[PDB]
Amino acid sequence: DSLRPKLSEEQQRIIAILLDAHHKTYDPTYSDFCQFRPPVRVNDGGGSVTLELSQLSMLPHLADLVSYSIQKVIGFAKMIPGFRDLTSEDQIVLLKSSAIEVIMLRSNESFTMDDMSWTCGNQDYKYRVSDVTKAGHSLELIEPLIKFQVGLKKLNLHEEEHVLLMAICIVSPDRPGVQDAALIEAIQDRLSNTLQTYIRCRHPPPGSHLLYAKMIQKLADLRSLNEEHSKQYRCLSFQPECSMKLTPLVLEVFG
Numbered sequence: 001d002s003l004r005p006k007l008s009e010e011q012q013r014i015i016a017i018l019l020d021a022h023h024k025t026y027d028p029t030y031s032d033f034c035q036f037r038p039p040v041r042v043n044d045g046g047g048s049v050t051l052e053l054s055q056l057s058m059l060p061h062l063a064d065l066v067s068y069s070i071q072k073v074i075g076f077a078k079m080i081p082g083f084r085d086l087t088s089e090d091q092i093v094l095l096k097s098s099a100i101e102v103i104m105l106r107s108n109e110s111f112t113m114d115d116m117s118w119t120c121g122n123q124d125y126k127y128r129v130s131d132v133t134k135a136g137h138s139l140e141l142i143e144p145l146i147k148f149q150v151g152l153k154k155l156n157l158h159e160e161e162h163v164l165l166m167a168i169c170i171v172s173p174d175r176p177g178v179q180d181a182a183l184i185e186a187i188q189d190r191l192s193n194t195l196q197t198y199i200r201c202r203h204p205p206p207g208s209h210l211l212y213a214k215m216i217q218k219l220a221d222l223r224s225l226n227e228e229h230s231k232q233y234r235c236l237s238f239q240p241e242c243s244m245k246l247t248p249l250v251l252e253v254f255g
């Protein structure tokens with residue numbers, strides 16, 4: 001019974017623009033990673049919080065990785081159709097509130113269920129839950145983060161759906177501090193309608209079944225991950241000399 005309206009010329013353009021934006025801001029070879037401060041993995045088989053906080057051995061590298069990724073997300077956001085129609089103030093509120101969520105989403109591309117790691121090259125740039133531990137985070141973040149990565153993998157999103165989801169995540173009218181919620185909602189609705197239309201006319205069954213609702217649930221999951229990351233970052237920040245292991249951009253976004 002369900003009607004399948006064709007994607008409009010505008011919706012086709014929105015998709016092409018977002019794919020282009022992603023291809024310009026996500027290097028699938030991870031070739032810049034050697035420029036970051038090097039990863040260091042202390043011996044921590046026991047998962048000692050005292051040792052993890054004393055050394056924060058993976059923090060400089062992972063902070064550089066996250067900081068780089070925030071820069072890329074800023075570039076991607078600026079190409080979202082309608083984003084530049086927002087005031088600078090609203091653009092910045094949206095970027096700061098969504099950055100960690102878009103990082104977790106976009107990282108799904110390097111995540112692999114082969115061994116449950118983010119595989120970004122040789123051994124040095126293969127990231128596991130134990131690396132997150134070594135950057136001062138705990139199971140309350142790691143467990144739901146891995147569950148999220150696998151759940152998102154198993155949706156088998158088309159790249160079109162993946163880039164639309166990132167855009168929808170960023171252009172959210174319910175973020176604290178937004179001024180023009182109605183304009184943000186209009187931009188988001190244009191994206192959401194594109195996604196709903198795309199799924200209904202371009203995604204074959206049975207993977208298409210209730211797919212939009214599943215994607216919306218992943219956005220809710222990301223809000224929870226954001227809250228948990230924030231709580232843990234706050235405590236990480238209490239570690240003397242932590243700021244030198246971060247970056248000015250990371251300090252601003254999470255502090």
Ligand SMILES: C=C1/C(=C\C=C2/CCC[C@@]3(C)[C@H]2CC[C@@H]3[C@]2(C)C[C@@H](CC(C)(C)O)CO2)C[C@@H](O)[C@H](C)[C@@H]1O
Pocket residue numbers: 059062063065066069103104106107108109110111118120127132135137233250
């Ligand atoms: C960040 C990305 C990539 C991987 C993401 C990972 C692997 C390492 C640990 C990360 C960065 C995780 C996503 C979230 C997770 C995190 C929980 C955030 C960091 C939080 C911080 C220490 C800054 O508070 C520590 O580890 C590689 C690649 O997919 C992209 C460059 C993507 O943007």
